[PDB]
Specification:
part of a larger assembly, about 50 residues, binds cholesterol hemisuccinate, 3 chains, membrane protein, mainly alpha
Chain lengths: ~50, ~250, ~100
Amino acid sequence: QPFRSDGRVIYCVNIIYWYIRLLDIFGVNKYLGPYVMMIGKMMIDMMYFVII
Amino acid sequence: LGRKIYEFYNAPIVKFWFYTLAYIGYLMLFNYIVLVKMERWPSTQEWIVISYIFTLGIEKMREILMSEPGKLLQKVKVWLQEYWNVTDLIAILLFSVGMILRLQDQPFRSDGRVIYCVNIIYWYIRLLDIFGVNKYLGPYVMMIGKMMIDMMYFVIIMLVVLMSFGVARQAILFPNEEPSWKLAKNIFYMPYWMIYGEVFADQIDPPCGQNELPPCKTGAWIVPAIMACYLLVANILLVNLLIAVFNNTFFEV
Amino acid sequence: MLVVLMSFGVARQAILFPNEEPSWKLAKNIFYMPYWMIYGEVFADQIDPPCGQNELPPCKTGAWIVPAIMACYLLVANILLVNLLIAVFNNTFFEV
Ligand SMILES: CC(C)CCC[C@@H](C)[C@H]1CC[C@H]2[C@@H]3CC=C4C[C@@H](OC(=O)CCC(=O)O)CC[C@]4(C)[C@H]3CC[C@]12C
Ligand SMILES: CC(C)CCC[C@@H](C)[C@H]1CC[C@H]2[C@@H]3CC=C4C[C@@H](OC(=O)CCC(=O)O)CC[C@]4(C)[C@H]3CC[C@]12C
Ligand SMILES: CC(C)CCC[C@@H](C)[C@H]1CC[C@H]2[C@@H]3CC=C4C[C@@H](OC(=O)CCC(=O)O)CC[C@]4(C)[C@H]3CC[C@]12C
Ligand SMILES: CC(C)CCC[C@@H](C)[C@H]1CC[C@H]2[C@@H]3CC=C4C[C@@H](OC(=O)CCC(=O)O)CC[C@]4(C)[C@H]3CC[C@]12C
Ligand SMILES: CC(C)CCC[C@@H](C)[C@H]1CC[C@H]2[C@@H]3CC=C4C[C@@H](OC(=O)CCC(=O)O)CC[C@]4(C)[C@H]3CC[C@]12C
Ligand SMILES: CC(C)CCC[C@@H](C)[C@H]1CC[C@H]2[C@@H]3CC=C4C[C@@H](OC(=O)CCC(=O)O)CC[C@]4(C)[C@H]3CC[C@]12C
Ligand SMILES: CC(C)CCC[C@@H](C)[C@H]1CC[C@H]2[C@@H]3CC=C4C[C@@H](OC(=O)CCC(=O)O)CC[C@]4(C)[C@H]3CC[C@]12C
Ligand SMILES: CC(C)CCC[C@@H](C)[C@H]1CC[C@H]2[C@@H]3CC=C4C[C@@H](OC(=O)CCC(=O)O)CC[C@]4(C)[C@H]3CC[C@]12C
Ligand SMILES: CC(C)CCC[C@@H](C)[C@H]1CC[C@H]2[C@@H]3CC=C4C[C@@H](OC(=O)CCC(=O)O)CC[C@]4(C)[C@H]3CC[C@]12C
Ligand SMILES: CC(C)CCC[C@@H](C)[C@H]1CC[C@H]2[C@@H]3CC=C4C[C@@H](OC(=O)CCC(=O)O)CC[C@]4(C)[C@H]3CC[C@]12C
Ligand SMILES: CC(C)CCC[C@@H](C)[C@H]1CC[C@H]2[C@@H]3CC=C4C[C@@H](OC(=O)CCC(=O)O)CC[C@]4(C)[C@H]3CC[C@]12C
């Protein structure tokens, strides 16, 4: 410390991305994969929502 | 008139609305059982409820033993084909073990009461089968059934996002906890009630390091930012996709 | 919604209050808390109230079911049937 708990915070932010990487495993399923790329399509529309 | 009684009674719409009114009667009696207290021995109203479940089980056993296929395995196979029959069997067995724990004195008695009120849920849901006779409600029932899979997909991706907000909240704010299962409660507690309204507004960024406070935990500013991210993704993206899924599946189903 | 709402009403008013007499206030409490939960108020204080501790009135046994099933109810009411009402309102709109 004082660096130790900040490294813990860095681990804590990294578990966010290591959950989001489950979408790659979700991309093998014939029912889930198109839904994942579909979310990737809807992100732009939500971006326009975010500016307005 | 002596054949007219038989003509009315054995007619199938009549024999259906008998069963509907008997189901409504049983369900009102079971509500009076489970809400009101229960003594050491069962009451009269509860004896009616016990008798309904037992004679229903007799009818289910009978209708197993009046199906055409020759083998007993074949009869239980063709009976296990229809899903409401096997859920009927499961609920009847759970109510019977609840009855056995009820007739037994405490502490088993109130556990039996718990089993009773968990069967209350399913014996409410069987009124959907009762609603299936209507030409306007039957298709709605099958519609609920067909969009449950579209909700299932939503449920897995919601678990993935909800656990993200959960772990990052439980591991920024609370930093020093021994191995305990209580963390698993917190993991699925606070993020899940945020979808349906309640943002838990008092407990996002408590005031801290002030004189009036407990010491500020390092990095506690990232929790409102990730709650912003989760709240936008959960209530603006995926629920709205579920709107879209449901509409474009409605025209087909 | 009436069927699903009252199954929740029965379940919560059964587990939480275990020694209630015949009274019509039970028929109020069966509808009261489920109904204002559709509209954006989940009654956050009484979701999993702390019980059986020293810091309180004890836990009714089986109370841990009451949050869990309520989770299920919020997935049925606010996510399934209101969304089907969106769909129902939307693809009969052209006709009407
Ligand atoms: C829990 C809190 C912190 C919210 C976290 C939000 C983001 C970190 C995640 C949530 C959903 C993710 C998106 C889900 C789906 C996709 C598609 C995927 O891209 C592809 O599959 C490539 C093809 C395509 O672009 O569609 C990865 C990017 C993207 C937009 C993801 C980008 C990162 C996002 C916005
Ligand atoms: C089967 C469905 C369609 C309901 C049909 C209603 C009636 C045929 C039954 C259902 C509940 C019954 C009641 C359940 C409990 C009681 C209390 C009972 O009083 C006692 O048991 C206390 C005195 C004693 O033990 O003798 C008198 C009959 C009564 C009113 C019963 C009268 C007949 C009722 C209304
Ligand atoms: C026509 C079909 C749709 C069935 C309609 C159901 C009614 C005829 C039943 C359902 C619940 C019954 C009630 C359930 C409980 C009681 C309490 C009972 O009083 C007692 O048991 C006294 C003892 C005590 O309460 O401790 C008197 C009958 C009554 C009002 C019952 C009257 C008949 C009711 C309203
Ligand atoms: C408070 C919580 C616990 C409520 C949860 C409700 C669900 C568990 C229920 C409500 C609607 C039900 C559905 C309504 C209609 C049907 C159709 C029915 O299937 C058939 O008739 C097909 C039979 C065959 O083809 O062999 C039974 C399953 C299903 C999907 C049901 C499955 C169970 C569901 C999703
Ligand atoms: C993709 C999803 C399913 C991941 C979910 C992750 C966590 C919610 C789980 C995974 C492993 C779990 C841990 C596995 C083992 C234990 C030990 C357990 O210890 C005891 O019960 C003490 C008993 C004793 O050893 O005397 C306390 C819960 C804990 C930390 C669990 C807490 C919750 C954890 C972290
Ligand atoms: C696919 C859908 C239906 C959800 C996926 C299932 C799991 C994510 C859920 C289902 C039941 C849940 C469990 C139900 C009960 C408990 C006990 C609970 O223990 C306590 O809360 C005791 C400590 C305390 O006093 O808080 C910890 C979470 C846990 C393991 C839950 C962890 C998450 C589980 C396994
Ligand atoms: C339409 C959307 C995309 C625009 C608005 C979203 C963000 C720009 C906002 C929403 C909530 C805001 C957060 C709300 C509260 C805080 C806590 C705050 O922490 C502190 O001040 C430290 C503690 C203290 O007060 O002593 C730092 C800014 C931050 C993360 C804010 C940063 C900006 C955020 C993420
Ligand atoms: C299934 C969906 C579509 C509708 C479900 C909603 C109603 C059946 C419920 C919701 C709230 C309930 C009300 C909540 C509270 C009261 C007050 C109550 O009056 C008292 O308790 C007297 C005042 C006092 O307690 O001093 C009379 C019943 C009433 C109107 C209830 C009647 C039934 C209501 C309207
Ligand atoms: C299954 C769905 C469609 C309907 C559910 C109906 C129940 C919630 C109702 C029907 C019968 C009702 C009972 C009928 C009679 C009474 C007696 C009543 O007692 C008095 O009013 C006391 C009078 C006095 O002081 O003498 C208290 C409510 C109670 C238990 C009622 C509670 C609510 C019940 C169980
Ligand atoms: C949703 C559509 C299809 C019609 C719904 C009708 C019933 C579900 C509602 C309509 C009026 C309601 C009743 C209005 C008034 C009362 C009195 C109320 O009594 C009290 O609150 C007593 C005072 C107290 O709480 O101390 C209990 C609920 C009850 C029976 C309500 C029960 C539910 C009822 C019958
Ligand atoms: C898959 C997506 C749709 C998320 C689903 C959320 C569930 C997995 C979560 C939400 C609320 C959770 C419940 C919230 C509170 C409790 C009480 C808890 O009971 C105790 O801790 C007992 C001690 C006490 O409370 O006195 C056991 C876990 C449980 C049922 C949790 C189990 C897991 C639940 C149902």
